[PDB]
Ligand binder design. Structure first.
Ligand SMILES: OC[C@H]1O[C@H](O[C@H]2[C@H](O)[C@@H](O)[C@@H](O[C@H]3[C@H](O)[C@@H](O)[C@@H](O[C@H]4[C@H](O)[C@@H](O)[C@@H](O)O[C@@H]4CO)O[C@@H]3CO)O[C@@H]2CO)[C@H](O)[C@@H](O)[C@@H]1O
Ligand SMILES: OC[C@H]1O[C@@H](O)[C@H](O)[C@@H](O)[C@@H]1O
Ligand SMILES: [Mg+2]
Ligand SMILES: [Mg+2]
Ligand SMILES: [Mg+2]
Length: 365
């Protein structure tokens, strides 16, 4: 009691958040400690269920319905004046069983990131990437590298031709899952065909793809706004644009709302409200985080007006509008775990595309 402990993922601007915390302490005398534990999103329900953990947890909104279902989150209590400061759809992302259970911070979607000096006119279709890779390979380069270990990054291609997570009835139907339909299989088959053709490697992860793109070894990558800061520091002149189409249809990235939840076991709920409402969710607070690692589009209207001019933010929102907001329902984690296994198994040859996605479908339903 009398201090704030915050958990936020290691790819976000946690040093910039810590600067917001130091301003909070200067004004209130209350120490703010920012940590970025690994697997924090799995650790939180295990320690919050024993009355331990951080006061505030940051994650995309898809994790928070499971937390709320287990009673681990405090209902947030912003007045109507504060609610009108943020975009209504961001509040929708953090509403569960009619109650607001987090503060929305930022809106994230994946984009195509490309090296302007290797591919001045980036490809508009996935289907043209193998021919581009062939020309780059004679120069000792590759067309594209992105994280193949996390299903977040492969989902936009799987969804393009018809894959989906849970069908929404304008409630989600947890038994109507689109992981093993013909569109999902077509997109995962194309990924596997690029791997078989040695346009990509099944073992490429986040670090490998980031290093290759930022050193100028691959012409393109797929990542979110948090990655731009490291590219700014690199020698690479990059642009951010629409994901390629597949079979003429847009890639459909899942849209995540970075959100801050207050632990139901926190003895500091009033302090957490003060910090999130009056320090973080201000133009100056978001700027401090954004200058560390870019947040993407932000939930705070006044600051989003200042970011909307950036072509990288414009591309982020264009991809977001072609994609889908993630469900926040507890079943979303089962979806992600099952799809992760399916993609890794198909990409590594441990299963066929059909057998992998059928098994995921059975697991989820
Ligand atoms: O044992 C397998 C892995 O299990 C753990 O990872 C899980 C997560 O616990 C799940 O929540 C889920 O992860 C989703 C995530 O919830 C979702 O928001 C999105 O994550 C993006 C994030 O929004 C974005 O801001 C940025 O940080 O990139 C993330 C993606 O890397 O998508 C995730 C799914 O890819 O599913 C994974 C399993 O895939 C555990 O943390 C791992 O250590 C473990 O490998
Ligand atoms: O966090 C990285 C992950 O790598 C995967 O191969 C493992 O199955 C997980 O337990 C972890
Ligand atoms: Mg983690
Ligand atoms: Mg509640
Ligand atoms: Mg792995």
């Amino acid at each position: 009691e009398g201090k704030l402990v915050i958990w936020i993922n290691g790819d976000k601007g946690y040093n910039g958040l810590a600067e917001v915390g130091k301003k909070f302490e200067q004004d209130t005398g209350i120490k703010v400690t920012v940590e970025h534990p690994d697997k924090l999103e799995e650790k939180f329900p295990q320690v919050a269920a024993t009355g331990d953990g951080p006061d505030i947890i940051f994650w995309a909104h898809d994790r928070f319905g499971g937390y709320a279902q287990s009673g681990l989150l405090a209902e947030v209590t912003p007045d109507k004046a504060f609610q009108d400061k943020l975009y209504p759809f961001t509040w929708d992302a953090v509403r569960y069983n009619g109650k607001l259970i987090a503060y929305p911070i930022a809106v994230e979607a994946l984009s195509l990131i490309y090296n302007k000096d290797l591919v001045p006119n980036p490809p508009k279709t996935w289907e043209e990437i193998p021919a581009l890779d062939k020309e780059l390979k004679v120069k000792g380069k590759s067309a594209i590298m992105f994280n193949l270990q996390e299903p977040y990054f492969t989902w936009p291609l799987i969804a393009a031709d018809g894959g989906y997570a849970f069908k929404f009835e304008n409630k989600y139907d947890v038994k109507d899952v689109g992981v093993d339909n013909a569109g999902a299989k077509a997109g995962l088959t194309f990924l596997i065909d690029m791997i078989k053709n040695k346009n990509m490697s099944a073992d490429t992860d986040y670090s490998i793809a980031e290093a290759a793109f930022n050193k100028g070894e691959t012409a393109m990558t797929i990542n979110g706004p948090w990655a731009w800061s490291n590219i700014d520091k690199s020698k690479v002149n990059y642009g951010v644009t629409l994901l390629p189409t597949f079979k003429g249809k847009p890639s459909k990235p899942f849209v995540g709302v970075l959100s801050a939840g207050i632990n139901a076991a926190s003895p500091n709920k009033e302090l957490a409200k003060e910090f999130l409402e009056n320090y973080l969710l201000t133009d100056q607070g978001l700027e401090a985080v954004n200058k560390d690692k870019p947040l993407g589009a932000v939930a705070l209207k006044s600051f989003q007006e200042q970011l909307a001019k950036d072509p990288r933010i414009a591309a982020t929102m264009d991809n977001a509008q072609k994609g889908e907001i993630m469900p926040n329902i507890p079943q979303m984690s089962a979806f992600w775990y099952a799809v992760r296994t399916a993609v890794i198994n198909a990409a590594s040859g441990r299963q066929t595309v059909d057998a992998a996605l059928k098994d995921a479908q059975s697991r989820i339903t």
